[PDB]
Every structure is written in structure tokens, then in C-alpha cells.
């Protein structure tokens, strides 16, 4: 007799998916929903390269640590790469105020230019601007931060100083400075020629008075002294006024910046490359339209949702019965 | 199978049918061959393509950054930040695994339904002109050339033309 039969497809596929009723079902065709591979390198996000701090921390980079002279160049980045435990930060020991907040503010900046807010030669006629320290050594020589000046007395005097800066740059200007706390009154008289000093930093919305705290304290980086670091964001059209009769670590270079909200800092040991991506992880970068990944929870930008799943494969074909 | 065809009364699949998901196998004096049903295969491809597009493209991702830093007097806020991150990862993991499990069962049910529907379509066309073997096959009570087979597959099969010849063979048996 003559026969016609109804049947269905089969192939050599070894794909397996999981279903509600049965696990590990072999199927003819399937698609993967889970990205589980990276390229092991750092790529451009949003089209622009990231800032590699290398050996430095954000604290060392933004203050101008003598061992970070190579990082001053760049003025554009999308995210920041920092070593897990950075070796070069605040070479002179002290408390960096609101440091995490500052790292969040600097997480991404579209335009970022450095300019000498108080020129070293013109701004301090009656103060010594050459102060250095062995804790901030560069090439076996005592140095200091590039963006700060250690003001000490000249001709046996530390006169009252008053210095203002008006932000005419039509962008937020980041100003950093410091206050020095000597270990003993003797060092205080030698450096600033006074026992009671004060530092005042005020703007239209900022106001804080600093008083040196002289005490003996454990040696950090071979220094019993301390320099507390401070910062403020000066809005365009606003003035910041520095008044001090001692202990001020004055600003030399400031930063006019324009933000790029939503980015951040990653801790990675992965090398750099010229690739581009919408997603980058500390392990490496990722592509694909896949809506899920299990590479790393810490992502940057628009990334597939991280899931702990080891496998997310949905069937499109039939049960494979060859 | 939920509809009883795949791994049911049609016990196996055909590696010989490369052209489609569902199709036919015919045996007559002229020849033997595997043929694919392009209409029902295309419908299944369209539906499952839209199913994949739905799962993938409902997931819209804004440009964001998970990582945050905290000092030693901010432990409660660090743990609150950790509770947020772990909590969303918990939910999306559970949603993704459950979604894939359930919709994989529905997708295999879907093929079972399509095969069953194609078998009933042919059975509704042949009527008494053929008898059901039980394995997804029909045995014609009349002769059926390659043009007659192509009418069964195209759904343009004509019942009256072969009805009288089928009745005589059915009466003989």
C-alpha cells in the first residue's frame, strides 16, 4: 500500500536545556541567554579611554604625589582604574576629609583642566614656598605634592596672608588645600613664628576655621606631624577666600571640571587595550546582546544583569529523538 | 508530551528531514522521500523568534555603576549598600532561572501541539480514504502518485476523486 507519515526533525545536536518537569533535555536548537566570557582587558567606554592611576590612589593623583608625575597629562576619561591596594597616596600622613565623597565626584569628568590657581612665584612675596619633606621623596630627593605649597616664614616672620580666587571659568573648580599640625610647640614656633595660629577658608556656601592641634603621635611614614587635607567645589561666579597666619598648606594648582554622572572606579589588574564596549568589568570587557552575565557583579555602564546562574539556555527546537 | 504526539504516538524524529521542523514522509511506487511542511514550520519560527525577542528585549539597561566605597565609621551604610546589591542579584537570578525553566516546558509543549495539529489536519482531509497505522502514518486505500502526495501536503487534496476507488478496496478488505 501507499503511505504518508507525519513526523518531526532530528539532528546531531548535543545541546541540553532544563525544563520544569525534566532536567538535561537534549534539543535540536537552542539559544544562550548568559554571557560567561570576557576578553581580559580594559576598553574604552562611551567611546573614550579610562584613567589608569597605576601605582597611585585617587588621593595621590589629585593632590599631586611626586611619584605620580606621569598621570597629570590626561584630561578625559569615562571610568577610573585603581590598583586594589594603592602604594602611593598621601605621602605625608594625615586625614583626607570626605575622601569617599570626592572619589564619587571624580568618578567621571567629561572635561577636566588643571590650572595654577595661585602661581608659586607671584602669589607669596612674604612667605617661603620651598618646603619639602623626606616622606614625599622623588628620585631620592625630598619633595612635596605638585598641587600644594608648604608655606613657611621668611625673614623671621610669617605675616598675615589673605588670598582670594574668583571662579570665572564657567565650570566647577575643585580646590584642594591642607593644614599642618606639628608634633611639638618648638616646631610650631620654628615654622610659623607663632604658638596660636588659624586657617580660614570661606566661600559663599563654605565656611570653616582650622586650628592646629599640637600633640605627640605615632610615627606614620617617619613623621609625627600631620597634614589634614580638605577640598571644596567652587561654583562659577563664586569666590573662595584663604586667610591664615600659619600652618596653611596653600593651593598651587586647581581643577576646572565638567561632570559625567553615573560612572565609577574599578579595582583591576587587567591590562589596557584599544577595544570598545558598552560594558567593562574588572576581569575584562563584555559585548553581545545577551541579557544576562555571570562574569562579575561590579559592572560599569549598561550591562547585562548579573546573575549567579551557571547556565541560562532556552530551547527553540524540539526534543531531539534521532 | 502534553499533547501526546512527540515522544507519544509519533515515537521518533527523522534525521533525514533536514528542511524543516515538521514534515512528511511518503512511500509510493514512484519513490520515497522526506518533505518539510514550510507553512507550519514558518509559523513556529515566527512565534518562537518573537518569544526570544520578548525575553531578551524587555530587559532595558541604564548606564550605571554598582561599586561604592565607605570608611570605617560607615559600616551600616556599607552593609545597606551590600543588602541592595545582593537583593537585586537574588531576585534577577531567581526570575531568570524560573523564566527559562517554565518557558522551556511551554516551548516543547508548543511543538507537540503543532505536530498534533498537523496530524489532525491530514486525518481530516483523508477521512475514510486511508487507515491510521497508529505511528503517525496513514495507509491509502487507493493509489496516490507524487501529484496526489503534493495535494495532501499543500492541503489541496481532493477527497471525491479517490473516494470510489477507496470504497472498493475498503470493501474488498
Amino acid at each position, epitope marked *: 500500500g501507499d503511505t504518508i507519515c507525519i513526523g518531526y526533525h532530528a*539532528n546531531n545536536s548535543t545541546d541540553t536545556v532544563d525544563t520544569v518537569l525534566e532536567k538535561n533535555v537534549t534539543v*535540536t*536548537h537552542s*539559544v544562550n541567554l548568559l554571557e560567561d566570557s570576557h576578553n581580559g582587558k580594559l576598553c574604552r567606554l562611551k567611546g573614550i579611554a579610562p584613567l589608569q592611576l597605576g601605582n597611585c590612589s585617587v588621593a595621590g593623583w589629585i593632590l599631586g604625589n611626586p611619584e605620580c608625575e606621569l598621570l597629570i597629562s590626561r584630561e578625559s576619561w569615562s571610568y577610573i582604574v585603581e590598583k586594589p591596594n594603592p602604594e602611593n597616596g598621601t605621602c605625608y600622613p594625615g586625614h583626607f576629609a570626605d575622601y569617599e565623597e570626592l572619589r564619587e565626584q571624580l568618578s567621571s569628568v567629561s572635561s577636566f583642566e588643571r590650572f595654577e590657581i595661585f602661581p608659586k612665584e607671584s602669589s607669596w612675596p612674604n612667605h617661603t614656598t620651598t618646603g619639602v619633606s623626606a616622606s614625599c621623596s622623588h628620585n631620592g630627593e625630598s619633595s612635596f605634592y605638585k598641587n600644594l605649597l608648604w608655606l613657611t616664614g621668611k625673614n623671621g616672620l610669617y605675616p598675615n596672608l589673605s588670598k582670594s580666587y574668583a571662579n570665572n571659568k564657567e565650570k566647577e573648580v575643585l580646590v584642594l588645600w591642607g593644614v599642618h599640625h606639628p608634633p611639638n610647640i618648638g616646631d610650631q614656633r620654628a615654622l610659623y613664628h607663632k604658638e596660636n595660629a588659624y586657617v580660614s577658608v570661606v566661600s559663599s556656601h563654605y565656611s570653616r576655621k582650622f586650628t592646629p592641634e599640637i600633640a605627640k603621635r605615632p610615627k606614620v611614614r617617619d613623621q609625627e606631624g600631620r597634614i589634614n587635607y580638605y577640598w571644596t567645589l567652587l561654583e562659577p561666579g563664586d569666590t573662595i577666600i584663604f586667610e591664615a597666619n600659619g600652618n596653611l598648606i596653600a593651593p598651587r594648582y586647581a581643577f576646572a571640571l565638567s561632570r559625567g554622572f553615573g560612572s565609577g572606579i574599578i579595582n583591576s589588574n587587567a591590562p589596557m587595550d584599544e577595544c570598545d564596549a558598552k560594558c567593562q568589568t574588572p576581569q575584562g570587557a563584555i559585548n553581545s546582546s545577551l541579557p544576562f552575565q555571570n562574569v562579575h557583579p561590579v559592572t560599569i555602564g549598561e550591562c547585562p544583569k548579573y546573575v549567579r546562574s551557571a547556565k541560562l539556555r532556552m530551547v*527553540t*527546537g524540539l526534543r531531539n529523538i534521532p | 508530551g502534553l499533547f501526546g504526539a512527540i515522544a507519544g504516538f509519533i515515537e521518533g524524529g527523522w534525521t533525514g528531514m*533536514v*528542511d*524543516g*521542523w515538521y514534515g512528511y514522509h511518503h512511500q509510493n511506487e514512484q519513490g520515497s522521500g522526506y*518533505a*518539510a511542511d*514550510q*507553512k507550519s*514550520t*514558518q509559523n513556529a*519560527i*515566527n512565534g*518562537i*523568534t518573537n518569544k*526570544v*525577542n520578548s525575553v531578551i528585549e524587555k530587559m532595558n539597561t541604564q548606564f550605571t555603576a554598582v561599586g561604592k566605597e565607605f570608611n570605617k565609621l560607615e559600616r551600616r551604610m556599607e552593609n545597606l549598600n551590600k543588602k541592595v546589591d545582593d537583593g537585586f542579584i537574588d531576585i534577577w537570578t531567581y526570575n531568570a532561572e524560573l523564566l527559562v525553566l517554565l518557558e522551556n516546558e511551554r516551548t516543547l509543549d508548543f511543538h507537540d501541539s503543532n505536530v498534533k495539529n498537523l496530524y489532525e489536519k491530514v486525518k481530516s482531509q483523508l477521512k475514510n480514504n486511508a487507515k491510521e497505522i497508529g505511528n503517525g502514518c496513514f495507509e491509502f486505500y487507493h493509489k496516490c502518485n507524487d501529484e496526489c502526495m*503534493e495535494s495532501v501536503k*499543500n492541503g489541496t487534496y481532493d477527497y471525491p476523486k479517490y473516494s470510489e476507488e477507496s470504497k472498493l478496496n475498503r470493501e474488498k478488505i
Partner: nanobody
Amino acid sequence: EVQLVESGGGLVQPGGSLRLSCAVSISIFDIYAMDWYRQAPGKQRDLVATSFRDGSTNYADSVKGRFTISRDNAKNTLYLQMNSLKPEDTAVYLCHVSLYRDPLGVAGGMGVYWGKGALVTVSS
């Protein structure tokens, strides 16, 4: 398995006309897309024309207005009517078929087949 056999390939003088035909062993009525590719020595494969199930047509800029693709459902044949031929149109023409519309590779790209080819030479 589906067989595609081209025919009509030969040499032709410029300004002439030629029709190529492609014979499919399986009914072409429900086939999603049927294509003509051309390949010249030292060149890549180029999409020349495409016919779709709905009756739509897509042509490359180079052959547009001079070439016409059409399918004869009854003869299971795909035609490429080439008019106003130029010497640059010299190529080996390839018949391609795609049974289904599968943008996401859902069905693994099944139902795609290639013809053997037919040489068209425009000279003198």
C-alpha cells in the same frame, strides 16, 4: 535535500538581454527568500537581487532598473531578466534560496541552499 540548477549562462555582446533560470526540486510557493548572487574572479560574492514570499523585490544599486527577478510558481523556477548588459556585469551567477524567515538563528539556519552557478560574459 533541495537541488538548485541554473541555466542560460553564455556569452553576450554589450547592450544585449539575457534571462537566467533556476530550477528547484521542491515547491517554491512558500519559500521566504530567493536570491541571485554574482561573483567575478578576484571579487567577493555580491547580492544582486532578492525575491520575497510577499512579492517584494530588492535590487543592488548597480543592477537596478536593468535586472528583474521573478519566480514562476508553476514551474518551480526563479528567473533573472538581465537587460542593457555592460562588460562590468561579467560574473558567475549563483542561485540562493532561504526557505524561512529566521533573523535570530532560531531554527539554526536550516533551509538555505546554493546553486551550482552559471557564467555570464559580456564582451566586445
